[PDB]
Design a protein around this ligand. Sequence first.
Ligand SMILES: *[C@@H]1O[C@H](CO)[C@@H](O[C@@H]2O[C@H](CO)[C@@H](O[C@@H]3O[C@H](CO)[C@@H](O)[C@H](O[C@H]4O[C@H](CO)[C@@H](O)[C@H](O)[C@@H]4O)[C@@H]3O)[C@H](O)[C@H]2NC(C)=O)[C@H](O[C@@H]2O[C@@H](C)[C@@H](O)[C@@H](O)[C@@H]2O)[C@H]1NC(C)=O
Ligand SMILES: *[C@@H]1O[C@H](CO)[C@@H](O[C@@H]2O[C@H](CO)[C@@H](O[C@@H]3O[C@H](CO)[C@@H](O)[C@H](O[C@H]4O[C@H](CO)[C@@H](O)[C@H](O)[C@@H]4O)[C@@H]3O)[C@H](O)[C@H]2NC(C)=O)[C@H](O)[C@H]1NC(C)=O
Ligand SMILES: *[C@@H]1O[C@H](CO)[C@@H](O[C@@H]2O[C@H](CO)[C@@H](O[C@@H]3O[C@H](CO)[C@@H](O)[C@H](O[C@H]4O[C@H](CO)[C@@H](O)[C@H](O)[C@@H]4O)[C@@H]3O)[C@H](O)[C@H]2NC(C)=O)[C@H](O)[C@H]1NC(C)=O
Ligand SMILES: *[C@@H]1O[C@H](CO)[C@@H](O[C@@H]2O[C@H](CO)[C@@H](O[C@@H]3O[C@H](CO)[C@@H](O)[C@H](O)[C@@H]3O)[C@H](O)[C@H]2NC(C)=O)[C@H](O)[C@H]1NC(C)=O
Ligand SMILES: *[C@@H]1O[C@H](CO)[C@@H](O)[C@H](O)[C@H]1NC(C)=O
Ligand SMILES: *[C@@H]1O[C@H](CO)[C@@H](O)[C@H](O)[C@H]1NC(C)=O
Lengths: 391, 390
Amino acid sequence: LDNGLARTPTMGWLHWERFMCNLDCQEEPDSCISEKLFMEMAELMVSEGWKDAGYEYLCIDDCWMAPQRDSEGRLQADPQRFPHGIRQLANYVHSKGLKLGIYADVGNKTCAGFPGSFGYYDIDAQTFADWGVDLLKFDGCYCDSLENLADGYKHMSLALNRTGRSIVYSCSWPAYMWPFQKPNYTEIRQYCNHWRNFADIDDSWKSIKSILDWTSFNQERIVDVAGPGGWNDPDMLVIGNFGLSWNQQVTQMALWAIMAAPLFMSNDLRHISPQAKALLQDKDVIAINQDPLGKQGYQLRQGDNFEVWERPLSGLAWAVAMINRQEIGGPRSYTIAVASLGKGVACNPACFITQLLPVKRKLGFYEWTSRLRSHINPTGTVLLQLENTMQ
Amino acid sequence: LDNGLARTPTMGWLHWERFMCNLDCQEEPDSCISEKLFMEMAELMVSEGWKDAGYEYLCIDDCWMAPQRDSEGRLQADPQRFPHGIRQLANYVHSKGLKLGIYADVGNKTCAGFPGSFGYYDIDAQTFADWGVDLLKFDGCYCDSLENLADGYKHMSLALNRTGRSIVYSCSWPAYMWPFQKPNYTEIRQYCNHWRNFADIDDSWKSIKSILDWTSFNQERIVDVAGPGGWNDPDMLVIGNFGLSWNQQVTQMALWAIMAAPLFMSNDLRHISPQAKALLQDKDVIAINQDPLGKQGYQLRQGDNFEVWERPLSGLAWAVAMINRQEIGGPRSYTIAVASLGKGVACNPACFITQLLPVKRKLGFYEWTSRLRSHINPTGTVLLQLENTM
Ligand SMILES: *[C@@H]1O[C@H](CO)[C@@H](O[C@@H]2O[C@H](CO)[C@@H](O[C@@H]3O[C@H](CO)[C@@H](O)[C@H](O[C@H]4O[C@H](CO)[C@@H](O)[C@H](O)[C@@H]4O)[C@@H]3O)[C@H](O)[C@H]2NC(C)=O)[C@H](O[C@@H]2O[C@@H](C)[C@@H](O)[C@@H](O)[C@@H]2O)[C@H]1NC(C)=O
Ligand SMILES: *[C@@H]1O[C@H](CO)[C@@H](O[C@@H]2O[C@H](CO)[C@@H](O[C@@H]3O[C@H](CO)[C@@H](O)[C@H](O[C@H]4O[C@H](CO)[C@@H](O)[C@H](O)[C@@H]4O)[C@@H]3O)[C@H](O)[C@H]2NC(C)=O)[C@H](O)[C@H]1NC(C)=O
Ligand SMILES: *[C@@H]1O[C@H](CO)[C@@H](O[C@@H]2O[C@H](CO)[C@@H](O[C@@H]3O[C@H](CO)[C@@H](O)[C@H](O[C@H]4O[C@H](CO)[C@@H](O)[C@H](O)[C@@H]4O)[C@@H]3O)[C@H](O)[C@H]2NC(C)=O)[C@H](O)[C@H]1NC(C)=O
Ligand SMILES: *[C@@H]1O[C@H](CO)[C@@H](O[C@@H]2O[C@H](CO)[C@@H](O[C@@H]3O[C@H](CO)[C@@H](O)[C@H](O)[C@@H]3O)[C@H](O)[C@H]2NC(C)=O)[C@H](O)[C@H]1NC(C)=O
Ligand SMILES: *[C@@H]1O[C@H](CO)[C@@H](O)[C@H](O)[C@H]1NC(C)=O
Ligand SMILES: *[C@@H]1O[C@H](CO)[C@@H](O)[C@H](O)[C@H]1NC(C)=O
């Protein structure tokens, strides 16, 4: 989408995976979807380094709305959970140097069942603009046909544009086509800053595997179309939560960088371990994700329960990731010819290799004809950065 | 098996899951299956508190054998990887106050392909007893019929008995039978101290869920047959490795206590986190697993992605485990009437409830009509102990 936004993958925080649609502020006041939750996160995004690391969008997912539109046909914030309204929230978020995302739906209802925007695209567009909304995640639930799905995503795009406000537009369009029709990503990119392709992530290794396997199975179809201002969205980071082992968290952070995915944390910033904080704020790994060239990585090979993925970076550099998919035994030896990496050219005549994950460590110079040997933990990933010696 | 052993479930260390069949001491000398590997583990079992926590059996799984029997038809320890032999390893292990477990197979080969004991039950049994072995894990690969399986398992039981040495006998008998026939756990209990019921565990949440799910489904068949001298074996503890979140690890420790499972660590004692060590050596949770009553627990109810399991204990006590099976979102509140627990007698007229996992905490007294509310992490487990007030 040629709106000047998302020139690198968007970074921020999204409430959904961790907090979902908890509307019970009587029993669970510290975890229900309320203005207070978001004010608290915005404070922590500044004070604990998230903004500095580059996480700047603070994003409301589903279940912020009141059940009914108002008399003028507008979506209303829920009055008991957001008593001061979205405008005041946006102002508060803006006063911290952060940006506000919000959620709406292309069809008649949101997935959680609140008012959808079908029949109100322009009004909802105007409302968000006026409130000072900086990003819109637009879901594809309760949409009766694919014609109506496309038209809606397009109409809202144009609507957002006509407001004159810069708003990052995140679509779920191709996800709700699959596997009923073949998305045309040239069309989709004309209208969207990013797009979800696949099923909802959850807090599981099954989920991460399934997203990586789906992406590599479909990479020939979706990798080339991504770039500055138009990205593949494989959904949230679930690092720092409950259901992934440390090695599986690293795999996610490594592969989200390789994939040029937007980086939306979904966790509790009030209760996050120093290790998860460290991984999510890893400067070198974020730098890979935020590479200005915006060329999305891909799976180079699979075999023997190993996976090799690689991403072309700027400055004649490459990021390479090796995953161990064997979920039994110990760390496993993997050996690859550096001549196979970077389409032959990463290490011609030589390259310097730095391990970034799971720990940072310089490996040294590797000549074109040589071999790389790593030990990779079960469900873990080694992330390497290759620097050609031609500069 | 009425041999005086396994009066509470056996606790120890077993190499398989973490170290597998790594024969390459050229490239990976510190992780290949060798005598040094077991000697180190043995040193650490003493120095790092494992033996004191209760873990006493150090057990070699598959891939310790040379490819051929010797000229007298005996199995032999691989000469490169066990140059000093199994006898000297046993003496070393014994000298630390520990006990040696070893592996063999009822069929013609082991699962890794080394010599099986079919045709050599008496000789192998004698070999092991002469060597000073204290436990035998007997696998069921490469058997051609279910009769030979049952016969084999039975024969070896008698053979070990005939040696006159105390040897804990672990059978994979029913695991290998289940695809074709319902096992006779009354028969199996007669010959074995424990029996593996199901597919091999791995370092994954999927695996663990599938063991609990299988065990709960089949609990009417297997729960009551277990007791002192004869246990259900849901396979190895995999806490301290790679594939499980902290919450998932707590779930394993908890349910393995509820199920009165033998507790066999399969990890690297040389490289284990303090948090994993603390969980595995948790005295109060071990105490539940080692309850002298030896009645195995069971799933009380499931629903709404929750499970409640309970286990009866000596002294009118009960252990209760609540599992959150929803793998999305945050800690989830669960409310249960204590009157539902312990067949209605757990808190009649009242009980004192202590939380043991994930953190030890006293929750006070509870009348028979009162309700308990806990917050359970996704894939995590809260484990409680209930003391009746009579
Ligand atoms: C996925 O979606 C995209 C975006 O819509 C398609 O790309 C577009 O394809 C259309 C073909 O219908 C192109 O239209 C042409 O535009 C050029 C301008 O450079 C005109 O010269 C050309 O005009 C002729 O043909 C028209 C016939 O109706 C008449 O208007 C004229 O009188 C004249 O005869 C025609 O309008 C778009 O340029 C093109 N847009 C982009 C961004 O590339 C995809 O189409 C495929 O991929 C294209 C790159 C190209 O190779 C097409 O030939 C392919 O069909 C579409 N993908 C699929 C699978 O359909
Ligand atoms: C509504 O839709 C319109 C129509 O697409 C959209 O207009 C486009 O805005 C973008 C971004 O502002 C324009 O792109 C710029 O083009 C000029 C040259 O014409 C350049 O100077 C700009 O350079 C910037 O970005 C470059 C990216 O390569 C960088 O190299 C550089 O650092 C600059 O920062 C940029 O390329 C585009 O030309 C217009 N298109 C048209 C036809 O007007 C508008 O922004 C939308 N409005 C909203 C609010 O969404
Ligand atoms: C080979 O097989 C034979 C036959 O099964 C087996 O002999 C059995 O040994 C057990 C235990 O040694 C005997 O059971 C004991 O009986 C005596 C006498 O009444 C009791 O003292 C024992 O009670 C104590 O220990 C019990 C635990 O088993 C506790 O329940 C109790 O609290 C006591 O502390 C115990 O009941 C059993 O009598 C014989 N069986 C027969 C048929 O004789 C033998 O041990 C096996 N040999 C080898 C080497 O495996
Ligand atoms: C391990 O391998 C050996 C070697 O093959 C197996 O022994 C063989 O078992 C077969 C089939 O059970 C026996 O065949 C039988 O032959 C009789 C005729 O004597 C016939 O009436 C039966 O119907 C059957 O076909 C065979 O005799 C026997 N051979 C030897 C060398 O003893 C053995 O069963 C295998 N053990 C296990 C547990 O898998
Ligand atoms: C919403 O509902 C109306 C009537 O129930 C239907 O005609 C319309 O097509 C629906 N819109 C979408 C996009 O699902
Ligand atoms: C199981 O085995 C026992 C002991 O051999 C025997 O008495 C009984 O009949 C068997 N019962 C079943 C389930 O067939």
